[PDB]
Write a protein that binds this ligand. Sequence first.
Ligand SMILES: C#CCN(C)Cc1nc(C2(O)CCNCC2)cs1
Length: 330
Amino acid sequence: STGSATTTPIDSLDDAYITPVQIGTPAQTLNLDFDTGSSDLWVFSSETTASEVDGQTIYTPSKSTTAKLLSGATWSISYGDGSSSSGDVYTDTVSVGGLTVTGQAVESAKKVSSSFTEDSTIDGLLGLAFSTLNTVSPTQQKTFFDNAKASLDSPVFTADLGYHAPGTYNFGFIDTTAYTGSITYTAVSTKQGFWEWTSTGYAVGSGTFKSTSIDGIADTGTTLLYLPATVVSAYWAQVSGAKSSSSVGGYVFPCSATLPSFTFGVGSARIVIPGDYIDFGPISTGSSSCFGGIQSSAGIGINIFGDVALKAAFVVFNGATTPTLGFASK
Ligand SMILES: C#CCN(C)Cc1nc(C2(O)CCNCC2)cs1
């Protein structure tokens, strides 16, 4: 089997991407944030505290003839940005772009943090990291991909995010028309539960390539690119007036600037992030200071190849017995 679904930026800055997902019988369609950096599928629901729902579409298990309470199971998650949610669990039928999984754990939110409430476009998350990170207790649950894997034509999914434009998540096949040149595959460590890999280095604009190993995770659920302070300082030093601001919480730059590209290494291959991708606009409406798309990972404990990097490539998440990650230009 295969699946193919379009993913769409939630705003003009590509802060996140939503993908329609069919849950239950008859289908309830929710727009979920596909997140290769976590492993819970959770949704706003009829059980979510009323004061914490503001515009989201909710899942109502009582209206689904295939919904079954997973008795005694609970979940609680907190993400890198400090946001969080928790609740209980149902199993139900879940379909993504024509691909159907029966008995999928659907984690129903009883509580969500303010940042989720304030984001009316995101009805939940669909985690695509390794199932060892799933937070359901006392019986850990499998991701949508983990459950679907045996039925897929090939045990893979691909992320093809657009720059200020829709993109595609495919399951079970590699669309050879969706990229240029060849796909370079690189080793993955699952020891932390992430799609963790090691980049071979970087370049700033037209500068010489610096060979240096940068361990990080491929995370569609993170907006920006987070790299070691040395690398990030080298990038912003090429932008007149750019500086790190503690009050804003990262590197800002003059909105009048033209940003240089940023290249990262995948084995012997190179992925180029256009300068425009690194511009996240005025820090506040009307401001002449703009927020940078490349930021320091120093206060995170891990480097994160988020959407800024990933949208510059066609990315293959290979969930074979020995998982690997593939990158192609597009
Ligand atoms: C490990 C480590 C340090 N972490 C507390 C910081 C991290 N945060 C994350 C995410 O929550 C970011 C959003 N997508 C899902 C993953 C991964 S690593």
